[PDB]
């Protein structure tokens, strides 16, 4: 299949990360993040969308702690707050970026219907042709985060080259993730290396060939 321009938008490990496709859809995502952040920053707007009795699978609006902007999220689990049995802690999957965060319901709103138009932007991937030098070492995860420059808008070229079945669910997961996992080649067109990211990891001792 054909190569595509992507950002790596979240990382769990070299064999579990998320990409966003660059193009009309990424422009539209950026605009939506701006519009959602503008909209939900107002308490009057938030009151139009107050969250009541949330449920697993629900698509909501939520504040991302680390930039205080508003994002689309899927509720993947709900559990009692162990200080306030009165309250709940929510496990959120950010559908356009791929990362997960635990959050207070106070920081969640119902999603205004027209914000559901754009398809969910984060695509879960694994890096083809690699395996751990061991579970991945933290140093390997760090190296992969460094090479992809995750969350810093670095353009990479990705190509789907294989698929594998998703590993057994050990936790609560997203509705979509319960479809094979695409295995990709990643390369950085701006790094002066002919090696793609898998080959860089292997030849530098952060990974083994599969």
């Amino acid at each position: 299949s054909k190569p595509m321009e992507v950002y790596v938008s979240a990382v769990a490990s070299p064999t579990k990360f998320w990409v966003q496709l660059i193009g009309p859809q990424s422009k539209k995502l950026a605009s939506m993040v701006q519009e959602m952040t503008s909209y939900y920053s107002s308490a009057e707007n938030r009151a139009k969308h107050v969250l009541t009795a949330p449920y697993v699978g629900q698509i909501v609006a939520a504040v991302f702690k680390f930039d205080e902007k508003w994002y689309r999220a899927e509720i993947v689990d709900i559990m009692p707050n162990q200080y306030n049995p009165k309250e709940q802690v929510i496990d959120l999957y950010f559908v356009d970026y791929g990362d997960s965060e635990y959050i207070s319901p106070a920081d969640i709103c119902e999603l205004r219907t027209d914000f559901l138009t754009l398809r969910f932007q984060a695509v879960e991937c694994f890096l083809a042709n690699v395996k751990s030098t061991i579970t991945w070492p933290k140093s390997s995860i760090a190296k992969f985060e460094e090479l992809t420059e995750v969350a810093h808008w670095r353009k990479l070229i990705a190509r789907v080259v294989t698929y594998k079945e998703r590993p057994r669910a050990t936790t609560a997961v997203s509705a979509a993730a319960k479809t094979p996992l695409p295995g990709v080649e990643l390369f950085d067109p701006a790094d002066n290396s002919e090696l793609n990211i898998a080959d860089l990891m292997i030849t530098q001792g952060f990974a083994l060939p599969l």
């Binding site: 979240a10 990382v11 769990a12 579970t135 969350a151």
Partner: peptide, 11 residues
Amino acid sequence: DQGRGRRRPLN
């Protein structure tokens, strides 16, 4: 078990 994605944007 290394299954939760994370992202940390600059600023």
